[PDB]
Design a protein around this ligand. Structure first.
Ligand SMILES: Nc1ccn([C@@H]2O[C@H](COP(=O)(O)OP(=O)(O)OP(=O)(O)O)[C@@H](O)[C@H]2O)c(=O)n1
Ligand SMILES: [Mn+2]
Length: 580
DNA sequence: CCTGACTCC
DNA sequence: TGGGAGTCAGG
């Protein structure tokens, strides 16, 4: 706890060295259009704090920020890059991101600030953010001297921690994963978040007004069927109605009371007309609260754009998550909800939305990894395995498969390969539990390689204490040797699933990097808007569609070469809804 | 603030 | 008693 630094009133030449740890501090969780409260720079010449009004209106500091040959080490550089974009400033030359480094070394640590990263190497000369800024309503930027010291201590930590973190990544064979995949991706996500997605608020509001009326009609029907008014959105009050007043069978309990999950209620549909109406009500209510109202709340009124934040250092598998708003869970399965997608439109006139999705990429990845002959065969003969399962499940022909049936058969394929039980399967399909068990048996017998892979991957996790993905991402599984059956089982199924979902995540990230480079090298105006796990969404002038119809799927397909091919479907249209 | 509901991959 | 996420209203 002893560290000298300069509290600078102006920018000097020595603050602009070609190598520096840089902190650009943004305290609000949502960094879009959020205040930069201070800057700190640490380099061979010393340690510096600058006020943002000083630094960010200085033409030399702005120049240095934007000079890719001036290298910066940071923590959460995407947060800084995006905040700086909202201030009209370009940040380049980020060569090390401690957040992403810590994330690759162990995603379970939940590293979310520099102090937490520091603890991984027993570096303790830096405070946690929460201790400096406080919590909830008490959250505040502290007095300049305290803030200055905090930002400089963070910068010093990044400075000292870079080499030890790189060394450990290197020992793990994850240095290139960080430097050639996650760090370049961070810059691409920053562009996408800043660009935002344009929303047709006129249409969304009209939808919302019509939905409110429809919701009211269903709400009354429900009260009529119940013989009484009650809060449908309280599973507690609903439970009394269904299971006490109406005396319907109790199929499941939670720790707080009776279950009213969709799975359960669907099973009660033959007992009383009220259950179907409740399900419908809860769907419509979620549309209203989340995809109409919640979405309008986050629309930037002046531009009509929404700006998601893609969390790149959160999930345990290597996936992204999307927040405020989550643009990776916009409805599609039911037509009622799918219409929400009509409100997502191109950011200018005569542009179009272009959507491309990998076909069954998880399962191709698994065919490659397991080297299963049959499954590989199905993808080398390139069939549609989900539809095939559907033909089997509903004892119907190819042309006889309805989009809902395939979706049910897709969940069954995913279920079985990832360790669903006979109980779980029998429930989902309403067959005898013996039938369910026989079906799983027939399944693994039809794909013995997948069978062997899943047995082997579990024993490997027991022995090493972690599993890996195709590009060397890691997940530690300390619970896999637990004496407790449930605990051990959950860990075992993580060993079965994480390597595949995580590998699929590795591949699409690589494709995003490849695609962006091809787009920029052709000076196309087309740019990425969103990633939805196995899908990439772009917008571009209508004139560019032809080029995109070739380039996007080709780049995606070539991102990696597996034993089986990768296949991508694509569509475009005037709205996200129409890109189908 | 947690639980359980709905949404997606 | 398949895996990974976020947001919401209610309590
Ligand atoms: N119930 C589900 C749905 C999806 N996924 C994961 O998310 C991936 C992509 O989702 P999805 O597009 O629905 O799977 P696809 O096989 O590609 O089906 P489709 O071609 O119809 O889009 C899956 O491969 C799987 O790894 C999952 O684990 N469980
Ligand atoms: Mn898909």
């Amino acid at each position: 706890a002893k560290m000298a630094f300069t509290l600078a009133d102006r920018v000097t030449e020595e603050m602009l060295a070609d190598k520096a740890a840089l902190v650009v501090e943004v305290v609000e969780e949502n960094y879009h259009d959020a205040p930069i409260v201070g800057i700190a720079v640490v380099n061979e010449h010393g340690r510096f704090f600058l006020r943002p009004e000083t630094a960010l209106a200085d033409p030399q500091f702005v120049a240095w920020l934007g000079d890719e040959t001036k290298k910066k080490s940071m923590f959460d550089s995407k947060r800084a890059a995006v905040a700086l974009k909202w201030k009209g400033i370009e940040l380049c030359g980020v060569s090390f991101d401690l957040l992403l480094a810590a994330y690759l070394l162990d995603p379970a640590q939940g590293v979310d600030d520099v102090a937490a990263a520091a603890k991984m190497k027993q570096y303790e000369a830096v405070r946690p953010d929460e201790a400096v800024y406080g919590k909830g309503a008490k959250r505040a930027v502290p007095d300049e001297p305290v803030l200055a010291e905090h930002l400089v201590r963070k910068a010093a930590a990044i400075w000292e921690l870079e080499r030890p973190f790189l060394d450990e990544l290197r020992r793990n064979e994850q240095d290139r994963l960080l430097v050639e995949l996650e760090q370049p991706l961070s810059s691409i996500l920053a562009e996408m978040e800043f660009a935002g997605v344009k929303v047709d608020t006129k249409r969304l509001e009209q939808m919302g007004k019509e939905l409110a009326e429809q919701l009211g009609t269903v709400e009354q029907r429900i009260y009529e069927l119940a013989g009484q008014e009650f809060n449908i959105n309280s599973p507690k009050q609903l439970g009394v109605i269904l299971f006490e007043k109406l005396q319907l069978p109790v199929l499941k309990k939670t720790k707080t009371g009776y279950s009213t999950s969709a799975d359960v209620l669907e099973k009660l549909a033959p007992y009383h007309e009220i259950v179907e109406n409740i399900l419908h009500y809860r769907q419509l209510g979620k549309l209203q609260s989340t995809y109409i109202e919640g979405l309008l709340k986050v629309v930037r009124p002046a531009t009509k754009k929404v700006h998601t934040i893609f969390n790149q250092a959160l999930t345990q598998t290597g996936r992204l998550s999307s927040t405020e708003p989550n643009l990776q869970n916009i409805p599609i399965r039911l037509e009622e909800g799918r219409k929400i997608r009509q409100a997502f439109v191109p950011s200018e006139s005569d542009w179009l939305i272009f959507a491309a999705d990998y076909s069954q990429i998880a399962l191709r990845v698994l065919a490659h990894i397991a080297e299963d002959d049959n499954l590989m065969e199905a993808f080398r003969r390139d069939l549609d395995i989900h539809t095939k399962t559907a033909m089997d499940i509903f004892q119907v022909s190819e042309d006889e498969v309805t989009p809902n049936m395939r979706r049910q058969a897709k969940a069954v394929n995913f279920g079985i390969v990832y360790g669903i039980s006979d109980y779980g399967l029998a429930q989902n399909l309403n067959i005898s539990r013996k039938e369910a068990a026989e079906f799983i048996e027939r399944y693994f017998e039809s794909f013995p390689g997948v069978k062997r892979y899943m047995e082997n991957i579990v024993q490997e996790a027991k022995q090493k204490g972690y599993v890996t993905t195709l590009l060397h991402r890691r997940r530690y599984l300390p619970d896999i040797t637990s004496r407790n059956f449930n605990v051990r089982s959950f860990a075992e199924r993580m060993a079965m699933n994480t390597p595949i979902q995580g590998s699929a995540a590795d591949i699409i990230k690589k494709a995003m990097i490849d695609l962006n480079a091809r787009l920029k090298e052709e000076r196309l105006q087309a740019h990425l808007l969103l990633q939805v796990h196995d899908e990439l969404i772009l917008e571009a002038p209508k004139e560019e569609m032809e080029r995109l119809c070739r380039l996007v799927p080709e780049v995606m397909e070539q991102a990696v070469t597996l034993r089986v091919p990768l296949k991508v479907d694509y569509h475009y249209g005037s709205t996200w809804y129409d890109a189908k």
